[PDB]
Amino acid sequence: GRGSEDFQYAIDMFKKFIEEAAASMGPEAVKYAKEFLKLLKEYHKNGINNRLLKIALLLLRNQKKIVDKASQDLWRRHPELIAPGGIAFSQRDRALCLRDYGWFLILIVMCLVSGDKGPIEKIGLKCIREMYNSLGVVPAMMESIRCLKEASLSLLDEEDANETAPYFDYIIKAMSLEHHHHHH
Ligand SMILES: C=CC1=C(C)C(Cc2[nH]c(Cc3[nH]c(CC4=NC(=O)[C@H](C)[C@H]4C=C)c(C)c3CCC(=O)O)c(CCC(=O)O)c2C)=NC1=O
Numbered sequence: 001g002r003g004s005e006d007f008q009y010a011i012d013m014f015k016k017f018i019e020e021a022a023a024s025m026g027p028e029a030v031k032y033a034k035e036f037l038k039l040l041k042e043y044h045k046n047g048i049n050n051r052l053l054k055i056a057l058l059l060l061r062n063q064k065k066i067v068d069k070a071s072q073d074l075w076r077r078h079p080e081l082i083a084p085g086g087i088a089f090s091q092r093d094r095a096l097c098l099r100d101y102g103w104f105l106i107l108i109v110m111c112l113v114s115g116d117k118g119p120i121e122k123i124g125l126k127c128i129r130e131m132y133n134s135l136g137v138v139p140a141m142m143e144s145i146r147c148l149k150e151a152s153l154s155l156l157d158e159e160d161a162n163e164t165a166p167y168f169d170y171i172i173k174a175m176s177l178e179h180h181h182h183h184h
Pocket residue numbers: 021022023024025026074087088093094095096097098100101103104107123124126127128130131134135141144
């Protein structure tokens with residue numbers, strides 16, 4: 001573990017995310033992420049919005065705390081996810097859940113620093129589709145992102161929370177549409 005208050009910390013977090021999720025998100029997603037990272041550094045050369053970078057660093061440095069808190073809330077609100085026959089019953093499966101939780105948070109942070117939902121439109125939506133192709137329609141999944149949102153915004157003030165909430169809402173709405181319109 002390591003946390004810093006520097007733009008290089010966010011850059012390294014994005015690189016690690018790209019490296020870890022490259023095989024899962026596909027080649028088009030990695031190209032988008034690489035282009036995003038290059039543009040962020042190019043615009044950082046001309047100065048960066050400190051408020052956005054502050055909220056991004058605050059969410060990145062507490063990534064694992066947010067993941068654990070959200071996962072605990074989700075298991076409590078839907079114990080069937082970790083019970084026999086559930087999607088997160090297996091140790092590997094539960095580990096994959098926490099992985100995707102951290103990746104959702106990385107995507108949120110990418111939108112934060114960019115002030116745009118682009119990274120969620122391109123990468124996020126596609127992955128939400130692939131993820132449902134491997135998991136199926138599990139109703140408890142709808143609370144998954146809510147817990148993450150509840151666990152992320154709980155570390156921010158009302159202004160920072162208001163700046164970050166729209167991306168969680170966009171993700172929840174997208175998953176809802178994918179969930180109830182998959183087999184159609
Ligand atoms: C709390 C709900 C969640 C759980 C239980 C999981 C675990 C999980 N991920 C997956 C697979 C999975 N996850 C995801 C999501 C993520 N991929 C990305 O690139 C994004 C960054 C990230 C979300 C944005 C995808 C696309 C896939 C498809 C297969 C793969 O992991 O590459 C499975 C299916 C295992 C299998 O049959 O091979 C499971 C069980 N991920 C959750 O979000």
